[PDB]
Design a protein around this nucleic acid. Structure first.
Lengths: 85, 43, 72, 247, 106
RNA sequence: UUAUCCAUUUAUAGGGAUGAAUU
RNA sequence: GAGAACUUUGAAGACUGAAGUGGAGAAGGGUUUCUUGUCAACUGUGAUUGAACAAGAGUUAGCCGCUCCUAAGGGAUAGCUGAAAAGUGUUUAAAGGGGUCCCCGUCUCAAAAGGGAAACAGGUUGAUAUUCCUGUGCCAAUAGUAUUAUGAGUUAGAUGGUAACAUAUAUAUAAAUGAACUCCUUUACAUAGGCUUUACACUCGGGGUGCGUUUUCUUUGCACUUUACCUUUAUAACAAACCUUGGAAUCAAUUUACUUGGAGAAGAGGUUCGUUGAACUCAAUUCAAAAAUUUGUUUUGUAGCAAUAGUAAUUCGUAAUUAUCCGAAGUGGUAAGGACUAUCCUUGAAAAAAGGAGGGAACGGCUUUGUGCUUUGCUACUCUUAAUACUUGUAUGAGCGUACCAACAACCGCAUCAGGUCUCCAAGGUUAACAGCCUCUGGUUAAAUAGAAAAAAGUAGGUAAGGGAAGUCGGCAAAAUAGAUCCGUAACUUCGGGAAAAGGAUUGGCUCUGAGGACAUUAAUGUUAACUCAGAACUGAAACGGACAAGGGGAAUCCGACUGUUUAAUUAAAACAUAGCAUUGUGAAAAGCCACAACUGGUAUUAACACAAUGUGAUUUCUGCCCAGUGCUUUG
RNA sequence: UCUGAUGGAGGAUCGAGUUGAUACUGACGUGCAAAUCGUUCAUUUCAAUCACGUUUAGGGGCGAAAGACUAAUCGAAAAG
């Protein structure tokens, strides 16, 4: 069934490193490899390709984004201010 | 080695040729002999 | 090596001036036949036959103005 | 004593940048009449990873106007630009994310990247991943514009200087914890030979002023003067203060 | 079990000295080293190889098969089918969308 | 701004209202 | 042979044993190679041997490499410094090519494992062979004319397919024009994981060709049966790419895994690239029905080389013919390919060289007018592949390497030194296994010695009654199970582990038995390929992963979080590093740090999520008071 | 939610080889050897191992730091 109670994909790390270190990478695993939404077809199938490069599973067209999220709040706010003019 | 340069091979041949003894007729009237295993000609 | 049974294309080569060599087998299927071979300057012309009479006819259809030879 | 580790770095034998796989210098388009008096639009064909840096690069094709032909320019990509979009560079370029504009033409409060601190520098400031400067003021007479850099510093740059509109991509890269020595090794393998560090206090006194002793301590104050020579500048150089800050 | 031996003068199994042995009419196992498989030319839109061509090395492609080099069409197979039809379906699209503009500009 | 110094380039257009485009 | 434990031959007993004293290997060596002769010294005993000595001989390339390209980088040029020596290498390139004015552009070296024109088989020598010989190919190159043909297109260039797709089978499938200028592609690239294909490897039973225990049993134990480079071969399936069309929903195709889709799926029809380069009647026919030509049923061929070369058994002048060469499969050991999935604060070379394209400078002829142009008559014409023959130099094919060792005595360790020193291959049995152990081809039976005796002592082991650490600084050393299956598994914990915790049982030997896939007929019955379980017996010296191979556990304390690194030759650790934490400096070519005699340079192909300089050293919880002193730092 | 059902991550584990060198403070210590031999031991998907090429040269280099290494030479190499 559910093999890991709380560790999740950090189970690859065993008991090494701090529990709080793994639990602070906890805030980020469930979204680093996540399938985000592509705005050129509309299927939530974008994948982490490199540090700042992102790709969906349909377009084969690449987007510059965040380190482990497709968009970061800092850039979204800036785009909002620019677009409101 | 099997693969070698022309100058190296010519020098090897010259050093081989310089390793024969004094001719018998001349002796009837040498110190610089090497063995391949004893003294290396340093090339 | 060119396995062939069409007759017109095989008799087409009957004018090529540079074919020289011929090879005669005696192969027993179980029936005595032969697999005649001729010489081609760019491939290895060898014919598999089906009829002994046909093999006999086409080993004489050759113009004999050149060499004769056989491995056996 | 002998020459210390920090002193040997300037010789540049093994401390030169590991740059075998780098894709090229990230530079803005060279200043041209077209860029000086209006938009010129280039198409970003591809977004590449430069092994040294964390910020992805944009391969923008510009069709040259002095001859038949296209020209390839490698520009640090802001967060949001995508393969196939058209990017306008120039005085009359519209103010949108990724466009290259003169600094005095944009309104104030806008976030910018790839800042060029002297006109014609084709990009000098604000280039690390996730970094952005903000336009905090236009001079009343023009020809001068005030920005706030990611360090919090406040700078005045002439209004003709160009910059990219938006923030540098791959933002937040320093957030995830480096779990192990291995990925730090891989990180610095494509940058430099600055890792591992080795404490100067664990060395011998011949190689470091912190070295020596029976108990592995510095022994003398670690705040060194700004005028200290090369083999002496090892502690906290010209430190205005020490200890935890208070905000 | 029989045993092997190399001939090509490059005795390190690099990716240009890949070995395959087959039995010879003499009765013993000799070494046959194959050439390197070469990549295929691709389209610029969605990163796909072009069809109607094969992928010989440059030396062999200097002698390659022409009808298996390019399709006799427009650019010659520079674009895959699903993207060259997209290019077409956009082609006169823009040529209509420009024409409507200067007409409606008055 | 002429001495002097710095940067950029292919020293490549006088100031104001994801398809191409050379002979 | 004067002389034989260590020269040769034959017989035996053994070893190396699939990770080899085996074949090829580079570096290094340099004639140690081969034949003949030979023993003054050497070959730590002998020696007739030899890598010793002496005389001769031996290395054959258009296809194997170098040579070419570029990389980390080296040298140099212009400058600029410097007394020079030297340092640096565009820091005000007046610096080689293209096409026909312009465009482009430092030079040179650096890879015998990176990129790359093109070769295979058989045979041959005392010593060379993918180099020589036989045969069969391949690649690059090839100046001006008169003949030919083929194919095309034409009185400036085709084909269908509702579509994807494909489109010229002459000796060869060449035969669908093209400048400047430009834009792509190939070369060209990481790791991990499994799936799949194919070749090779190995193996299985009944067919063709030989040896054997058999006091006792035997269809008896075993042993010898091939096919290179050369063909998109066609295939075929599957891998993937691609169109009409159903237009799903009571979503569907599917993979080992997830992958995909209303920007097209069930479901249907349809077509290239990628493999292995005989497979499905592939190249035909005997014959039938379709029809101005196809589908099916029968005969030839180890799909085409190909057997005739090579290999093998019995006779036979000492030179030969003989006959076989078959149906199939099964395991997955090694390679390569394919389509995928995953990983990176790591994204995993370049150039020579080749190709494709956009564009449209220039495109049918003979002769004739005036000045490449209008023009008058005729219109057959032009290229692609192969050449034929006269003309320039002679119009193919440089130069270098090629023997042998590669350690076991040919290399480095002063040596013929138990040391050191860069790939592939792998049957059984046993196995999880390229482990260990034994054998099979190949190699060896040699080690600076041999006999005899066999006490002490040494050294490398083995076993010891009863006790079981009483020994000793200290359980040092050795013993103790240790594989697999089933069961069971505590404290503590960062919830991931601890854990093979701890602790049990079985496995022996045999008679057994039973159960778990692909191939077909109108719920059933026939051909043919597993190793997982189970309980009843009995049995055998109450004992069995039988050899080999293979954890000792537990309770705690100290240190270091961990993986890692270190004093080559006395210290491997608690030391170093490490992630994490924190501090400091720096907004740039008038900056921070550092190099340099100067010139100039590294960081820097960089830009505060950066660089530089420190301290501490996972996580958790904390990190108190002191600025007097010494430092550092800021104002006036 | 758990109970069962499907899979291939990790500077994960054992373990040959490779790379080393914990202990016997074994042998040897006029050695096979100016560092070897035997058993035992650590290590094997990565901060991994190896080869060639290449860069850094002596008050210099290089150093996961031992005053380590820089050709049997190192708290300043070797040669004159």
């Amino acid at each position: 069934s559910r093999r890991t109670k709380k560790v999740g994909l950090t189970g690859k790390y065993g008991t090494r490193y701090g529990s709080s270190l793994r639990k602070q990478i906890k805030k980020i695993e469930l979204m680093q490899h996540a399938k985000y939404l592509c705005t050129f077809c509309g299927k939530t199938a974008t994948k982490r390709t490199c540090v700042g490069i992102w790709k969906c599973k349909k377009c084969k067209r690449k987007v510059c984004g965040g380190a482990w999220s497709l968009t970061t709040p800092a850039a979204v706010a800036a785009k909002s201010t620019i677009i409101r003019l | 080695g099997s693969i070698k340069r022309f100058r190296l091979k010519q020098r090897l041949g010259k050093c081989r040729r310089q390793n024969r003894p004094v001719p018998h007729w001349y002796r009837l009237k040498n110190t610089k002999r090497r063995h391949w295993r004893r003294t290396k000609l340093g090339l | 090596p060119k396995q062939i049974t069409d007759i017109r294309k095989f008799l087409k080569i009957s004018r090529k001036p540079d074919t020289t060599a011929v090879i005669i087998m005696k192969k027993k299927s179980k029936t005595v036949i032969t697999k005649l071979k001729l010489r081609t300057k760019k491939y290895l012309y060898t014919m598999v036959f089906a009829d002994r009479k046909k093999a006999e006819r086409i080993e004489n259809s050759l113009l004999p103005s050149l060499k004769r030879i056989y491995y056996p | 004593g002998r020459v210390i580790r920090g002193q040997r770095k300037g010789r540049g034998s093994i401390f030169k940048s590991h740059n075998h796989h780098r894709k090229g210098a990230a530079k803005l388009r060279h200043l041209d009449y077209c860029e000086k008096k209006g938009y010129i639009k280039g198409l970003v064909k591809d977004i590449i990873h430069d092994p040294g840096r964390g910020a992805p690069l944009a391969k923008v094709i510009f069709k040259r106007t002095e001859k038949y032909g296209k020209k390839e320019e490698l520009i640090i990509a802001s967060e949001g630009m995508f393969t196939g979009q058209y990017i306008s560079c120039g005085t009359k370029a519209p103010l949108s994310v990724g466009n290259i504009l003169p600094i005095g033409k944009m309104p104030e409060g806008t976030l910018i990247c790839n800042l060029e601190h002297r006109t014609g520098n084709r990009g000098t400031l604000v280039k690390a991943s996730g970094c952005y400067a903000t336009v905090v003021g236009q001079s009343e007479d023009g020809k001068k514009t005030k920005v706030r850099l990611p360090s919090g510093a406040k700078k005045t740059i002439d209004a003709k200087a160009r910059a990219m509109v938006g923030v540098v991509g791959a933002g937040g890269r320093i957030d995830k914890p480096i779990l192990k020595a291995g990925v730090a090794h891989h990180k610095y393998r494509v940058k430099r030979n600055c890792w591992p560090k080795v404490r100067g206090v664990a060395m011998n006194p011949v190689e470091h002023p912190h070295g020596g002793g029976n108990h592995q301590h510095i022994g003398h104050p670690s705040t060194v003067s700004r005028s200290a020579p090369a083999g002496q500048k090892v502690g906290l150089i010209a430190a205005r203060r020490t200890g935890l800050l208070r905000g | 079990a029989q045993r092997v031996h190399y001939r090509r003068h490059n005795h390190y199994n690099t990716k240009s000295n890949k070995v395959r042995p087959v039995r010879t009419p003499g009765g013993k196992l000799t070494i046959h080293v194959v050439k390197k498989k070469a990549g295929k030319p691709k389209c610029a839109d969605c990163k796909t190889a072009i069809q109607g061509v094969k992928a010989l090395r440059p030396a062999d492609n200097y002698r390659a098969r022409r009808k298996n080099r390019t399709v006799a069409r427009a650019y010659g197979g520079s674009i895959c089918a699903r993207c060259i039809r997209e290019r077409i379906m956009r082609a006169f699209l823009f040529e209509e969308q420009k024409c409507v503009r200067q007409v409606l500009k008055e």
